[PDB]
């Protein structure tokens, strides 16, 4: 599942909220996968994108209704490319 999280990896701190309502998770998962493109190969999150199953693209705003409040975090988020 994707909920709408703040990611702040000390040095690399990203947003992971649902975006509008008009736009989807698909959306900012691309700019995801090309911004840090870490995601998609190794992550660590508390919860938020799991490994085996990750969040469908169906899912949005309107989907989730959550807030920011979450507070997501990330862990073995590097790359180094």
Do not use: C, H
């Amino acid at each position: 599942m994707a909920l709408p999280m703040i990611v702040k990896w000390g040095g690399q701190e990203y947003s992971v909220t649902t975006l509008s309502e008009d736009d989807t998770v698909l959306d900012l998962k691309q700019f995801l996968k090309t911004l840090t493109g870490v995601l998609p190969e190794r992550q660590k999150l508390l919860g938020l994108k799991v490994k085996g199953k990750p969040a469908e693209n169906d899912v949005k705003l309107g989907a989730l209704k959550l807030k920011p409040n979450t507070k997501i975090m990330m862990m073995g988020t590097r790359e180094e490319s």
